[PDB]
Amino acid sequence: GKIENGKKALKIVVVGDGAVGKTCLLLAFSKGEIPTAYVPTVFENFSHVMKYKNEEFILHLWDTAGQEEYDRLRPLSYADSDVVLLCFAVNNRTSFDNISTKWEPEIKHYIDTAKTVLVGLKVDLRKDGSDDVTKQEGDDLCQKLGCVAYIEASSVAKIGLNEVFEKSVDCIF
Ligand SMILES: Nc1nc2c(ncn2[C@@H]2O[C@H](COP(=O)(O)OP(=O)(O)O)[C@@H](O)[C@H]2O)c(=O)[nH]1
Numbered sequence: 001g002k003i004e005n006g007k008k009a010l011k012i013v014v015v016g017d018g019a020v021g022k023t024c025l026l027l028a029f030s031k032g033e034i035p036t037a038y039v040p041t042v043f044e045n046f047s048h049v050m051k052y053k054n055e056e057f058i059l060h061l062w063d064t065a066g067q068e069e070y071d072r073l074r075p076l077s078y079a080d081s082d083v084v085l086l087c088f089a090v091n092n093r094t095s096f097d098n099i100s101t102k103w104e105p106e107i108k109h110y111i112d113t114a115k116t117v118l119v120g121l122k123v124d125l126r127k128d129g130s131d132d133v134t135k136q137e138g139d140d141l142c143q144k145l146g147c148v149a150y151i152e153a154s155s156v157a158k159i160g161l162n163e164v165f166e167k168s169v170d171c172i173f
């Protein structure tokens with residue numbers, strides 16, 4: 001619950017296994033596309049203005065990673081976070097299981113006061129006949145972990161991107 005110029009402001013941190021699509025989520029959400037160019041391991045934190053209810057919110061968006069120096073820097077990203085997106089890829093069951101084994105506990109340790117939103121990324125990839133994570137599985141995990149919501153999204157297909165960040169704003173304001 002911050003106010004930075006005259007605009008309500010929110011800090012959102014994005015966490016989850018490598019390659020679940022965290023950097024693409026932020027690029028697609030804020031830039032409206034994923035550029036054909038070298039995608040960085042971690043996007044430096046930045047502010048994005050989002051027009052929502054009928055007002056403007058300033059979102060302070062923090063990408064994170066677990067490779068190279070970013071693994072060591074990650075804990076420092078959490079301070080004063082209002083919302084944490086717990087991200088996995090729906091076609092990667094390992095990443096889903098790690099929400100419970102690694103990511104939710106890490107968040108509870110460093111920033112228990114943050115609200116969490118469970119985010120099922122790469123939903124464009126879900127298909128019958130594999131062991132892809134279902135919407136019911138995401139809903140159940142959200143329930144067990146006390147997240148505010150489970151939201152499915154695709155950066156590539158532009159599905160659910162605004163919903164993720166609109167729900168983030170909603171649970172704070
Ligand atoms: N099909 C599909 N692929 C995606 C999507 N988002 C990301 N990817 C792919 O997943 C790879 C890893 O994404 P990235 O954002 O770098 O993952 P990060 O390590 O969690 O930040 C990228 O090379 C994309 O090719 C998506 O919504 N749909």
Ligand SMILES: [Mg+2]
Nearest residue numbers: 023041042065
């Ligand atoms: Mg990344």
